[PDB]
């Protein structure tokens, strides 16, 4: 059934597997392998190998991992190991196979061999990302991880929005909630139409406003409104923009927003219609709770 590959097309580009429950992830890998082995028709080679490594990384995500070696050996045929992906696969293999730190130093000189730019900028961008991902296991957690990002981020590559997005999390959790607003603005700089940076940039303002002065409370809430309304222009059924509009309207409730509550309620009930799955549970919960 060729409809299957549609999800797979999503799952490569979206990395949907990353935030999946191991129960449904285990279902996903089982549901995958049947179509991977059976429905071998009409799909490109590039899609083939993107699906093949995405099988590898699902299998490493799976709790059984010996099949990861199988997929890697079969995928090691093409372009040797020099591309960014096989650097990733060999590093995560060497790091998981014995829980040895070794790959980093074997990757360390690699970046010192990237001093000549032996590979593309995106490659050692991703190497910087995954070596830091190693190092945050070396140093199990700290705020200085972001400080490490700075020597990697503000010196070498502002352009990766993922870096500023991740930095926002570590600022937002316990750090100052204002530098997340700057960084999320920088995310908007990189891509015009990120409509989830739009919801988050309003949420961080709202959480900042919860601990601010009254005039700053109204100022930040008003800016949060105009950012959540900026969410809405990019989508109709976007649950988080409409919801965050309705939330600050619940907080404020003043006459013109009461009309926008009626309009947002019609749209949010349309969202909380069963066209949407599971997300509807969170949407309805806030709808009917208060």
């Amino acid at each position: 059934k060729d409809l299957v590959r549609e999800k797979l097309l999503t799952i490569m580009n979206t990395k949907a597997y990353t935030q999946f429950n191991p129960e449904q992830l285990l279902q996903l890998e089982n549901e995958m392998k049947i179509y991977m082995k059976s429905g071998d028709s009409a799909l490109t080679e590039g899609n083939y190998f993107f699906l093949m490594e995405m099988l590898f990384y699902v299998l490493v995500y799976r709790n059984q991992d010996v099949d990861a070696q199988v997929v890697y050996n079969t995928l090691r045929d093409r372009l040797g190991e020099n591309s960014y992906k096989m650097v990733i696969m060999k590093a995560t293999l060497l790091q998981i196979n014995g829980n040895d730190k070794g790959a980093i130093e074997y990757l360390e000189n690699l970046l010192n061999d990237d001093l000549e730019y032996e590979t593309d900028f995106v490659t050692y961008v991703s190497i910087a990302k995954k070596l830091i991902a190693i190092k945050t296991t070396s140093k199990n957690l700290s705020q200085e991880s972001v400080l490490k990002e700075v020597v990697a981020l503000t010196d070498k590559f502002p352009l990766d929005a993922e870096l500023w997005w991740y930095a926002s999390e570590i600022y937002f959790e316990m750090g100052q909630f204002e530098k997340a607003c700057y960084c999320l603005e920088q995310v908007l700089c990189i891509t015009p139409f990120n409509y989830a940076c739009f919801g988050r940039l309003s949420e961080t303002l709202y959480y900042e406003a919860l601990r601010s002065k009254k005039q700053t409370k109204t100022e930040l809430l008003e800016k949060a409104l105009k950012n959540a309304l900026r969410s809405v222009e990019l989508s109709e059924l976007y649950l988080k923009g409409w919801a965050l509009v309705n939330i600050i309207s619940r907080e404020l409730g003043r006459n013109k927003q009461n009309d926008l509550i009626k309009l947002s309620a019609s749209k949010l009930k349309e969202i909380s219609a069963k066209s949407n799955n599971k997300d509807k549970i969170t949407a309805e919960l806030i709808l009917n709770k208060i």
Binding site: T44, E45, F50, L79, K85
Partner: protein, 49 residues
């Protein structure tokens, strides 16, 4: 049987059809050479998967 202009209607008695056919086959074989090669090579090398 006489031809004023030389024969334009008759196809020929004397085509080198074998040369034409072989050149067509040269086209087909060069397709067989390059298509798996170039498709794999360029798509996978420029994507650096």
């Amino acid at each position: 049987r006489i031809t004023p202009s030389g024969q334009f209607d008759l196809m020929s008695p004397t085509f080198e059809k074998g040369k034409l056919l072989i050149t067509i086959f040269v086209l087909l074989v060069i397709t067989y050479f390059i298509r798996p090669s170039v498709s794999n090579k360029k798509l996978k090398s420029q994507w650096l998967i």
